[PDB]
Design a protein that fits this description.
By secondary structure, the protein is an alpha/beta fold. 40% of the residues lie in helices and 20% in strands. The protein has a 6-stranded parallel sheet. Strands 2-1-3-4-5 form a 5-stranded mixed sheet, sandwiched between helices. Strand 1, helix 3 and strand 2 form a beta-alpha-beta unit. The protein starts with a helix and ends with a helix. The structure holds nicotinamide-adenine-dinucleotide, magnesium ion and sodium ion. The site of magnesium ion has 7 residues, from helix 9. It catalyses: (3R)-3-methyl-D-ornithyl-N(6)-L-lysine + NAD(+) = L-pyrrolysine + NH4(+) + NADH + 2 H(+).
Length: 250
């Protein structure tokens, strides 16, 4: 990582912590502890690079959350061996399809996708100044679906939309979410987006001071629409989802 990148990671996490605290009354750590019922004892976490930067970002992130983390010198299997040999209690590693946390002490394993969906949906659901239990979920994929599922389990009135009609069909029958028509816009104060696309939240769906909790990249909404409605944005590239994985595994 360049000097700029390191500054950016800490800046984004601090900014994310403030935004989450403003919205929910708790920081990311607080959200995680309440979500999972776990507490951190500064567990030793071995981050192993996989050949199928990212790991350097993970190191900065895990240190920020108080973990005793290190990155192995070797990648892949040699790295895994090195991590276990050096007393890693939790292993953190990713290929192109899967990013996992594996707690070797208790056997618990986390997948980044549902962990990210759940925490971003949790943050959204815990908006203190919410005037209803209506929540809009945009994107019902590997991150969105678990997020919507969590909101349903918390007895929220969950509206969902996905541009993939088959996935929308699946979610509407298996989860019991209300299919949302973007052409029939109702106003929401709680929005959860999990899409790799921009401009996915129509203006007409927005109300003033609404919370948009989104792990999606690029941003679901433009800066101009964000400013016009004073949207309380919760958006961070990696750390929040990583914290969710670690706490879910403790
Ligand atoms: N910030 C983080 O920590 C973090 C962690 C994991 C993933 N992500 C990001 O979250 C995003 C979603 O991840 P994923 O694994 O669920 O992807 P995915 O492909 O499994 O799901 C994305 C879904 O969004 C839907 N979609 C696309 N455009 C849409 C539109 N205009 N309206 C409604 N739905 C639309 C697609 O049909 C798809 O089902 C990705 O950008 C990913 O990189 C972020
Ligand atoms: Mg994140
Ligand atoms: Na997006």
């Amino acid at each position: 990582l360049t000097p700029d990148d390191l500054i950016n990671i800490n800046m984004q996490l601090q900014k994310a912590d403030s935004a989450v605290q403003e919205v929910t009354g708790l920081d990311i750590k607080g959200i995680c502890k309440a979500l999972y019922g776990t507490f951190s004892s500064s567990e030793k976490v071995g981050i192993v690079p996989v050949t199928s930067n990212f790991s350097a970002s993970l190191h900065a992130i895990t240190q920020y959350f108080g973990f005793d983390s290190f990155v192995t010198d070797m990648p892949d299997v040699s790295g895994y061996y090195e991590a276990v040999q050096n007393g890693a209690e939790i292993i953190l590693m990713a290929d192109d399809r899967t990013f996992l946390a594996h707690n070797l002490k208790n056997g618990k394993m986390a997948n980044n996708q549902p962990c990210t969906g759940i925490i971003y949906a949790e943050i959204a659901s815990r908006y203190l100044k919410a005037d209803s239990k209506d929540v809009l979920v945009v994107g019902l994929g590997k991150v969105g679906f678990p997020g919507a599922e969590h909101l349903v389990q918390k007895d929220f009135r969950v509206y969902g939309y996905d541009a993939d009609e088959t996935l929308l069909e699946r979610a509407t029958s298996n989860l019991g979410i209300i299919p949302f028509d973007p052409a029939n816009p109702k106003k929401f104060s709680i929005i959860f987006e999990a899409t790799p696309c921009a401009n996915t939240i129509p203006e007409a769906v927005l109300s003033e001071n609404c919370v948009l909790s989104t792990p999606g990249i690029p941003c679901a909404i433009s800066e101009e629409l964000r400013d016009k409605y004073e949207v309380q944005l919760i958006a961070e590239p990696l750390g929040i989802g990583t914290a969710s994985m670690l706490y879910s595994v403790l």
